[PDB]
């Protein structure tokens with residue numbers, strides 16, 4: 281039932297996944313197990329999320345029960361910022377493999393086009409914004425391409441099946457494509473009615489790069505983090521344009537918001553933190569939006585970005 | 600006096616210059632010669648402007664009459680998109696040198712973070728959007744850093760005093776800073792009240808990069824090219840906010856638009872096509888805008904971009 285998308289690398293990636301950011305450590309395993317029982321097969325995780333050991337427990341538990349085999353589960357992870365230097369890339373990937381308890385991850389992405397100064401894993405893991413000097417941010421001179429080549433070597437070594445990037449603007453992705461032997465199979469960016477970036481999406485899809493949207497419900501996710509910007513933003517669930525389209529097809533606003541992406545070939549990985557949501561978030565491909573619908577939603581685009589490195593330390597990623 | 604800006608390369612750069620774009624070949628020489636007579640010292644040129652040979656005639660004549668010495672003239676040039684591949688960098692720079700009839704250029708900029716397929720000089724010069732296959736665009740897989748390194752070597756050979764980039768968004772600039780040995784001394788971008796990109800300016804300036812603004816008069820220059828977008832945009836010269844501020848200080852809208860940038864440490868290179876504009880465009884530093892003025896002008900920022908590769912061939916530079 282859940283459509284697969286064929287990546288430029290030859291492997292299939294489910295179009296509907298399970299988000300693991302801010303997935304509580306104490307219940308991470310159980311939630312992953314339930315998601316697997318509910319039908320999810322792609323798990324979008326990350327070194328920075330700090331819950332890979334658990335995500336691993338969930339997947340292993342399902343595998344041990346015979347519900348699924350390793351090849352049926354699609355595991356996505358992300359290289360955190362302190363590990364861009366080539367000499368530390370495999371190290372970080374190993375930590376990820378050890379925590380997830382597997383021989384390979386299906387998708388590994390450069391989490392951010394930012395290079396924090398390396399912090400040994402034994403000193404602090406996950407490091408988050410720590411750069412080895414108290415609260416200060418510290419960076420290291422590592423061009424993306426260097427990190428990317430380190431990743432290509434790891435694909436040949438069999439530790440990764442497909443590699444990609446996250447939070448990359450158009451210019452950066454274009455340049456990376458000039459030096460890449462293995463083309464980034466995936467581009468994972470914040471995508472929702474308030475931040476549509478139609479041109480970025482067009483370029484990437486045309487280049488054969490698969491788009492995975494994150495924070496498909498816009499401000500919601502950051503509201504849960506008490507972020508001021510998100511709090512001051514009218515929810516997409518209660519937006520007049522969204523409710524209308526929802527009523528028209530007798531669907532829920534949440535279903536329209538996910539369909540809006542899916543129908544354009546964009547993979548989604550919603551955070552389903554309630555049994556009911558687990559079902560809701562993978563059964564929305566039951567209707568089609570019309571051109572008129574898309575034009576109406578396209579109007580909501582105001583370039584409102586909630587996940588912005590500029591907020592951390594004025595990093596110019598999206599300026 | 601036109602104050603100078605000490606570049607990170609250590610060399611001084613006139614904070615006000617003479618734009619050479621669209622400067623006709625038949626009169627380019629005379630115009631530059633006159634600008635020199637009127638006090639201008641920086642001349643922003645470009646291989647793509649197709650008039651470097653004439654810009655040289657103007658300076659040579661000024662030198663021959665003893666009006667100035669080579670040391671006193673600041674010549675800026677830009678490496679066009681078909682010459683990114685390293686081996687073509689020195690040939691292109693040389694054609695610029697022979698054309699300008701000088702031994703070195705004070706500033707050489709990567710014109711665009713776009714690498715067009717090389718086209719021999721003798722086949723067409725300047726090539727513009729010509730890529731060697733009729734009207735089709737063809738590109739080269741040459742990462743920015745490859746080109747950048749090619750430029751650094753030329754600085755060592757004493758053929759360029761300072762190097763920099765033009766039309767580089769934030770992410771891309773940050774990534775070059777990681778691979779650059781010689782940091783980009785300059786960043787030249789479209790900059791006017793309709794496209795302020797304040798964060799880009801802030802980041803660049805804090806990284807020690809100098810900002811050179813172009814199209815300081817908004818849609819004006821592109822209105823003189825019959826560009827749809829420019830013609831359907833209220834000129835900054837008539838705009839209520841500028842008009843009011845200009846009236847307040849008994850200055851023309853052009854003086855207000857130029858001071859808006861200069862006061863913020865940004866270099867300007869207006870195109871003075873008339874004897875009076877020539878003078879005025881270099882005598883506007885006679886008043887300061889107030890905090891309130893900046894606040895009012897800041898409201899004009901709608902991120903309206905006139906020079907966009909997206910229009911050429913949907914090149915994702917600014918998306």
Ligand SMILES: NC(=O)c1ccc[n+]([C@@H]2O[C@H](COP(=O)([O-])OP(=O)(O)OC[C@H]3O[C@@H](n4cnc5c(N)ncnc54)[C@H](O)[C@@H]3O)[C@@H](O)[C@H]2O)c1
Pocket residue numbers: 298299300301302324325391446447468493494495496497498500501502504534549550551552553557560561587
């Ligand atoms: N690479 C990155 O930079 C990055 C950044 C953010 C998120 N992600 C990934 O994408 C995932 C999804 O993004 P997100 O975590 O911000 O959350 P989201 O946007 O998917 O959902 C946010 C919130 O809305 C609620 N919600 C979910 N489904 C709902 C439904 N059907 N009805 C009503 N409310 C519902 C939940 O409370 C949830 O916490 C993450 O778990 C993570 O894996 C990646």
Ligand SMILES: NC(=O)c1ccc[n+]([C@@H]2O[C@H](COP(=O)([O-])OP(=O)(O)OC[C@H]3O[C@@H](n4cnc5c(N)ncnc54)[C@H](O)[C@@H]3O)[C@@H](O)[C@H]2O)c1
Pocket residue numbers: 617618619620643644677710765766787812813814815816817819820821823853854868869870871872876879880906
């Ligand atoms: N690197 C790049 O990508 C790039 C792109 C465009 C321009 N540039 C450079 O920067 C310069 C500025 O850009 P531009 O020439 O497009 O536009 P501009 O802002 O210099 O001026 C645009 C037009 O307004 C008029 N104008 C000039 N001074 C005036 C005054 N005092 N009062 C009223 N009208 C006036 C002229 O007719 C002129 O053609 C160029 O000459 C060129 O050297 C660089």
